[PDB]
């Protein structure tokens, strides 16, 4: 009778008190609003139809031992424009014997995985023993210009005019001819008998367009011979060496003039070739040089400058056995817009020692999915807005932000007991 029943709310120690706007909650468990997200290491893209890749052989779908030799799936290989044994650099200079492939294509996002094919191993030397530096700079520009154009294509031949005294040249170091891009040309000249040739002048034209492709900017290679000194040069040459590229008006845009700059070679009696990367607007350029040699530019990569975009560059090296290089690596990391992909472990291929390495494969696997964000720190296709460590700089998309696991908000869970007003809670 004189009893008393009551719906009671009782909270012990296994509690926790989450406070809220307009009433709180005691709870037995609690969990995070969002989970911290880890970046999947490797390369991926967004849109999947706005990307294109330039390939090796590890990407060459139409290669004999296919699946095996590949570092990518078929789906991916389909989006690649490769050809076994090629390299953008190889096509740039067209050295003898080495494969000359017409790389070109369009895409908002360009993925490069080429280069190994012209590593120190290639042991090419056409008046130059260590090409790496050039490789570096060449790559550096390809990436820069690539990250600002939509379309790009090798321009395998351009309108030019060579003088008559000069005649096509062949070289010992260059197997038995010469490179295709810097094109050698020479004229009989013997200083001894006091017969110095006719200083030559030759023109060349960077096109406004090349087939479908619109060229707003050309990447050409300005090359010249570096002699140790006058007398040495004067051994086979008559006055003072020089090669210069002037523009429509006599403005100079490149070269080397030993008539005002000092000789800086150190290769003894024979010169060394130096190739500078030049970005030239389209037009009619001319070059002037000392009689004996003329290194005429006859090729280039053409970029429209239509739009900005991301660039992924995969490192290209040999399995053990042959000497590789990090020009690519260096270059990617030294230019805004490209993301470098590198292996931690060495290369060991399935097809053979140099094709189909596991790591690389699980690295470039992302190219098959659509990510929410891609960074130099990796990619992520998950959805939370937070991550443990700060994603790295070149990054595109909806990238999560860094935040301590603790600092993220908590949601009440398990048993919930609503708290009332103020001193409602009495022990």
């Amino acid at each position: 009778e004189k009893i008393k029943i009551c719906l009671q709310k009782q909270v012990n120690s296994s509690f926790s008190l989450h406070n809220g706007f307009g009433g709180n909650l005691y709870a037995t468990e609690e969990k995070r609003m969002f989970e911290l997200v880890k970046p999947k290491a490797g390369a991926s893209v967004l849109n999947q139809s706005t990307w294109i890749g330039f390939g090796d052989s590890r990407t060459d779908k139409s290669n004999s031992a296919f699946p095996r030799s590949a570092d990518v799936s078929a789906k991916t290989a389909d989006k690649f424009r490769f050809l076994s044994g090629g390299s953008l650099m190889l096509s740039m200079f067209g050295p003898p014997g080495k494969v000359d492939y017409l790389y070109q294509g369009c895409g908002k996002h360009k993925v490069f995985y080429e280069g190994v094919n012209w590593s120190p191993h290639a042991a090419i030397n056409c008046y130059r023993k260590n090409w790496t530096d050039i490789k570096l700079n060449f790559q550096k520009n390809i990436y820069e210009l690539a990250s600002q154009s939509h379309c790009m294509s090798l321009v395998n031949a351009l309108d030019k005019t060579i003088p008559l005294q000069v005649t096509a040249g062949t070289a010992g170091n260059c197997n038995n001819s010469f490179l295709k891009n810097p094109a050698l040309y020479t004229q009989e000249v013997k200083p001894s008998e006091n017969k110095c040739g006719k200083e030559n002048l030759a023109f060349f034209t960077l096109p406004t367009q090349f087939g479908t492709y619109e060229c707003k900017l050309h990447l050409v290679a300005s090359c010249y011979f570096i002699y140790d000194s006058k007398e040495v040069y004067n051994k086979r040459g008559c006055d003072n060496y020089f090669q210069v590229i002037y523009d429509s008006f006599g403005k100079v845009v490149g070269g080397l003039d030993n008539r005002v700059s000092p000789y800086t070679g150190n290769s003894g009696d024979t010169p060394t070739m130096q190739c500078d990367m030049l970005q030239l607007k389209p037009g009619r350029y001319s070059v002037r040089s000392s009689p004996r040699f003329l290194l005429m530019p006859e090729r280039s990569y053409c970029f429209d400058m239509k739009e900005k975009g991301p660039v992924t560059a995969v490192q290209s090296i040999w399995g053990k056995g042959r000497e590789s290089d990090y020009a690519v690596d260096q270059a990617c990391l030294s230019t805004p817009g490209c993301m470098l992909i590198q292996k931690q472990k060495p290369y060991i291929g399935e097809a053979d020692d140099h094709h189909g390495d596991q790591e690389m494969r699980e690295l470039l696997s992302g190219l098959d999915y659509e990510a929410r964000c891609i960074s130099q720190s990796g990619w992520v296709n998950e959805t939370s807005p937070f991550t443990e460590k700060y994603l790295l700089p070149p990054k595109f998309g909806r990238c999560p932000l860094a935040a301590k696991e603790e600092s993220i908000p908590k949601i009440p869970d398990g048993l919930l007991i609503p708290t009332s007003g103020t001193d409602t809670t009495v022990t």
């Binding site: 009893i3 029943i5 009782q10 406070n19 070149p394 949601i411 609503p418 009495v426």
Partner: protein
């Protein structure tokens, strides 16, 4: 608060005792303040708690990333920035979080009031309902049997005056 056993208005804090929703009974000539759960009444709250907890998932999932789209090609470090951007988004999240907790809280309580009404709606004999959540029945009219019917719910030994 209501002596040793309070209503659906307050909440008992017993650092080491039982915890949850339960039935607190006490007589006027008694020192023993019985506490016990009626897992049959809970049956509602418990399910509702689920329905409630369910909502969070939705609304949280619903947070369509107040997250920025970047085209950062430059290499300069931006931590001082990324950090501040994060401290903010964190803050934004906090509020919308409390927003969820409170809504839950509100709906849960409003749901405990759903029980009272229902329990109260169980006899003019019971119908003592003093304070909200608390009622005083007379075991001379309401023996354990109906007490159990009234609350717990065993469906055995009632009393219809018709």
């Amino acid at each position: 608060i209501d002596d040793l056993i309070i209503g659906v208005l307050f909440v008992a804090i017993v650092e080491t005792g039982i915890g949850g929703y339960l039935l607190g009974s006490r007589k006027e000539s008694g020192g023993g303040v019985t506490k016990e759960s009626a897992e049959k009444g809970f049956e509602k709250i418990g399910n509702d708690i689920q329905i409630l907890k369910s909502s969070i998932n939705i609304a949280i999932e619903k947070l369509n990333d107040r997250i920025s789209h970047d085209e950062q090609a430059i290499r300069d470090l931006t931590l001082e920035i990324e950090n501040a951007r994060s401290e903010a988004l964190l803050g934004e999240l906090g509020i919308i979080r409390a927003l969820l907790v409170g809504n839950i809280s509100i709906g849960l309580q409003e749901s405990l009031w759903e029980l009272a009404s229902e329990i109260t709606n169980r006899a003019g004999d019971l119908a003592v309902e003093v304070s909200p959540g608390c009622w005083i029945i007379d075991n001379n009219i309401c023996d354990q049997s109906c007490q159990n019917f009234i609350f717990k719910f065993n469906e055995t030994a009632p009393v219809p005056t018709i």
